[PDB]
């Protein structure tokens, strides 16, 4: 039973590696359109389009999920109901990972990486372009229950892992939001500290595309021309 909630100006992330300060630069990249309905779930298989926006208060990427093609985890024969189990022991008051039934076996492996061992809100953006798997995130503390906070917050990149394989489906491992990225062009405002304070759409609203044409956040009273029909 999926639920639909309107997005509120979220999903802006630094498009490139360059530092700009107090500039009104514009660029085109795979972004999240503003005010778009996003599925709300409270473990279905979700198709992976050109881009995904995950934000909730363990991920599985693959195609067949039967140890026939390599699958990103963060050749595995996934179970019918793959999950993770943390058991609260009675002998000692601690939470151990007694139950582990994520997959069956791993025969062939291409790349393996293990990092260091490891109320709020986590935002995640996944995109595979030119064989690179880039993850964007920001751990933003909030104290709300329902309704994504209004405002803006950039998403700094975490790391790039070069894999470059087919990704069509993904399954998560409890409320989470999933949105889909589309090719769009925004006008990314910058400040003295070189942070993206605000941004504006260029295809949503004729006023927005007027702002896009003028390259400013204030529109003087009068008539303007934007595009061609």
């Amino acid at each position: 039973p999926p639920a639909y909630t309107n997005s509120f100006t979220r999903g802006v992330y630094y498009p490139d590696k360059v530092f700009r300060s107090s500039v009104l630069h514009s660029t085109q990249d795979l972004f999240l359109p503003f005010f778009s309905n996003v599925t709300w779930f409270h473990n279905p298989v979700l198709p992976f389009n050109d881009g995904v926006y995950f934000a909730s208060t363990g991920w599985i990427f693959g195609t067949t999920l039967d140890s026939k093609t390599q699958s990103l985890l963060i050749e595995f024969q996934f179970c019918n109901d793959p999950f993770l189990g943390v058991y609260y022991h009675k002998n000692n008051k601690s939470w151990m990972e007694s139950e582990f039934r994520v997959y069956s076996s791993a025969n062939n492996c291409t790349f393996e990486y293990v990092s260091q061992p490891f109320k709020n809100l986590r935002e995640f953006v996944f995109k595979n372009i030119d064989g690179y798997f880039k993850i964007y995130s920001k751990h933003t503390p909030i104290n709300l229950v329902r309704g994504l906070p209004q405002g803006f917050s950039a998403l700094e990149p975490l790391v790039d892992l070069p894999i470059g394989i087919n990704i069509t489906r993904f399954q998560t491992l409890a409320a989470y939001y999933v949105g889909y990225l589309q090719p769009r062009t925004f006008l990314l405002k910058y400040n003295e500290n070189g942070t993206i304070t605000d941004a504006v759409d260029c295809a949503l609203d004729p006023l927005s595309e007027t702002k896009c044409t003028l390259k400013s956040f204030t529109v003087e009273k009068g008539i303007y021309q934007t595009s061609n029909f």
Partner: protein, 296 residues
């Protein structure tokens, strides 16, 4: 304008050497139908040291001068190793049509790299022919740049069903080279490698072994930061990058702040003093002394 006084060079300290033994003459080479791809990172790529392990008979590049390979550092170089016939070396070219160039591994029009191939006499030649190497001949549609095919279906010609239904006009697209030493030189096996890479799209990874020098500030000189060359003063930067920044641009879209690869610091860039020179005179007939005026 004032001329630079000296020059400086800064390059990350890397001692690893890129392994080319498997890329060059080795025990096995892949097929054109399933072309192998290898990743090269965090090592040193030299070209003059490539003339002692295996013989070279084809040394050409498209987009990069083959005499500056030790001058500019690279980023994410790709090497594709496979074997094709000797009469197909011209087919591996940007925008040049060909049987392999259409129904097999192709090359994008904006390719920037080198294509290297050498003749194989008996390394990949058998008396009865080499049937291990397969080359596609039939395809429903042309491949997009850097695409692989693994399907073993029987090509469909006409209205007769194929793809497992063997019958009329059903042909297997994969044929065998059948390399034999008795054949002509134009049909001998050729081990071709393709070097594709990106420049200034990310932090530098594979660079030439030319060492860095001590950093000098307050004097505008020729600087080369990670393959970026220019001219300007070097001064400390009060503005602070994020941990994932290394370049800086302005409204003019020109580089002005570059992270030092060695000391991991930030240096601001500003061109040397520049302006215009004008002179005034009270009249040639009256006298000869003149005055000099500078503008900026």
């Amino acid at each position: 304008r004032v001329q630079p006084t000296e020059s400086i060079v800064r390059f990350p300290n890397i001692t690893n050497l890129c392994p080319f033994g498997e890329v060059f003459n080795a025990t096995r080479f892949a097929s054109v139908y399933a072309w192998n791809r290898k990743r090269i990172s965090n090592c040193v790529a030299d070209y003059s040291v490539l003339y002692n392990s295996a013989s070279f008979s084809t040394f050409k590049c498209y987009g990069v001068s083959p005499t500056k390979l030790n001058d500019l550092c690279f980023t994410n170089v790709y090497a594709d190793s496979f074997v094709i016939r000797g009469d197909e070396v011209r087919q591996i070219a940007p925008g040049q049509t060909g049987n392999i160039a259409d129904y097999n591994y192709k090359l994008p029009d904006d390719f920037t790299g080198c294509v290297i191939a050498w003749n194989s006499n008996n390394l990949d030649s058998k008396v009865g022919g080499n049937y291990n190497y397969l080359y596609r001949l039939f395809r429903k549609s042309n491949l997009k740049p850097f695409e692989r095919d693994i399907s073993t279906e029987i090509y469909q010609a006409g209205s007769t069903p194929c793809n497992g239904v063997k019958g009329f006009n059903c042909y297997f697209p994969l044929q065998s080279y059948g390399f034999q030493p008795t054949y002509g030189v134009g049909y001998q096996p050729y081990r071709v490698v393709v070097l594709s890479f990106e420049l200034l799209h990310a932090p530098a990874t594979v660079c030439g072994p030319k060492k860095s020098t001590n950093l000098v500030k307050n004097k505008c000189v020729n600087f080369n930061f990670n393959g970026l060359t220019g001219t300007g003063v070097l001064t400390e930067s009060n503005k602070k990058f994020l941990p994932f920044q290394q370049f800086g641009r302005d409204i003019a879209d020109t580089t002005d702040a570059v992270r030092d690869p060695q000391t991991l610091e930030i240096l601001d860039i500003t061109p040397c003093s520049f302006g215009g020179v004008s002179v005034i005179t009270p009249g040639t007939n009256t006298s000869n002394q003149v005055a000099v005026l500078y503008q900026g």
